[PDB]
């Protein structure tokens with residue numbers, strides 16, 4: 001729509017506007033004419049309609065730039081980092097996980113990757129339904145002989161095959177990210193931080209374990225597994241210590257979601273029915289979020 | 291009751307141990323292809339459900 | 353499929369598509385007849401020559417536009433296949449060119465410059481990854497002729513930049529034949545199907561079939577070339593979806609694909625000198 005008000009965003013790639021209930025995202029056109037991450041982010045967000053992925057009302061052309069629409073309210077990152085412990089493990093940890101996995105499954109059954117998943121990518125709504133947006137490095141799931149990119153997702157939310165250097169991966173790299181969203185939501189801390197380097201591999205090995213030959217096979221075919229040594233995987237003494245605010249069935253699909261095996265990683269069709277939402281209490285979308 | 295996904299289930303069938311495809315079944319025998327999480331049934335489930343998307347008509351256009 | 357961009361706003365019927373052709377030929381007549389009555393400053397001498405070029409251009413290109421854009425679609429197909437591209441990006445380039453010229457005519461945007469831009473937006477669409485200068489040195493472009501007709505191509509395309517194509521239904525019905533049937537399989541069906549039906553669907557994308565039916569229906573239409581035991585025994589044993597309606601849909605799609613007529617070397621003369629340049633002859 002042709003309505004504008006005050007701006008959000010200090011980034012030089014895009015500065016988003018606001019107006020009407022909507023938010024106009026403008027890509028500055030002024031090398032190449034149009035960037036990869038403008039057509040790459042309109043061409044899959046145009047064709048999805050869901051209550052967990054935002055949609056385009058109009059994509060009307062500007063004089064030089066490209067206009068989109070977005071959502072009004074802020075994101076999941078400002079919810080976690082600044083509260084007075086409103087969020088409670090009976091109900092608030094279940095509904096947002098259920099809706100984010102619903103959005104991830106709607107991306108997956110359209111065979112679209114969406115390899116940029118962050119709490120500043122997951123944003124809420126006035127009725128509190130969390131949305132999946134910002135498809136800036138998304139890609140359709142191609143033919144198996146096609147070479148993909150490498151560094152496609154951010155550091156703190158990176159799948160370990162992307163740490164190791166998997167050039168042509170599957171779409172199981174975005175279940176690891178939402179499992180880290182689960183742990184970041186029930187721990188209220190930035191989970192697995194790195195020092196702007198290759199140190200994400202060492203902190204992931206320190207947290208969840210250096211993969212062994214017997215279990216996730218062919219991990220030594222990356223020219224990175226020989227650089228380091230083995231670390232012990234965590235046992236079920238993690239149930240009380242460092243994860244004491246959790247239920248019995250939460251650790252089952254958390255450990256099934258933080259599998260470092262990508263072939264044995266639980267896809268969303270077996271994460272939406274992983275008997276964790278069946279346990280009491282039932283969730284409800286009125287949550288005390290400002 | 292409740293449903294985890296509100297409407298997200300197709301009713302068609304699949305059997306991945308039957309085919310003799312010369313583009314993926316030979317492609318999965320390599321080393322670096324397995325190491326990125328690739329198996330045969332994921333690609334076949336990707337392509338066979340795409341082969342049945344949209345069996346409608348031209349009467350359903352107005 | 354109804355949530356996809358190809359169904360909700362670019363899938364048509366025969367009456368709706370012919371209405372689309374006559375409205376893009378009806379909205380693009382007045383500006384072009386106004387811009388080609390420009391005579392000299394004082395008076396016009398060659399009245400008969402400018403009226404026979406007006407009779408060649410204005411009431412004749414309402415049907416010459418369709419085989420003109422089919423000829424230039426054949427041109428962009430052979431130059432996209434010339435520069436070593438996959439069959440997926442060739443199909444998207446053909447679809448982007450044809451979808452550009454459904455909303456605009458060939459006179460107010462010349463088709464000789466769109467044919468290098470569509471390969472660029474197709475390879476940047478599904479990640480081919482050619483650069484601009486590497487694309488220019490492999491073509492007859494000097495970096496400016498591939499980028500000026502880019503904003504308006506996306507505006508006239510209205511940003512339906514992902515397209516569904518029948519090659520993944522080929523790889524699906526390459527496998528679903530073998531699952532339901534075991535009598536006569538995979539000798540001739542890997543001998544002479546993957547090398548023939550692919551070229552038949554490139555010839556189908558040159559024709560006007562993808563605005564009519566879904567790409568599995570076009571796939572099962574082009575699989576009916578060998579209908580001795582394959583397609584009839586496939587659709588009878590598959591059976592929520594009735595069979596005979598799908599056989600009639602595939603049969604009328606085959607009736608659509610069989611009304612074929614290739615290009616010629618005559619359409620070139622009308623646009624070569626009459627439009628924008630012949631006048632110069634009249635002037636001097």
Ligand SMILES: Nc1ncnc2c1ncn2[C@@H]1O[C@H](COP(=O)(O)OP(=O)(O)O)[C@@H](O)[C@H]1O
Nearest residue numbers: 008009011016023070071072073074121134136
């Ligand atoms: N719908 C929105 N409502 C409010 N703020 C938004 C909205 N969308 C984006 N923003 C802001 O735009 C910026 C996102 O731009 P970008 O850097 O491209 O995302 P990313 O870091 O995932 O790559 C963020 O600062 C975000 O706060």
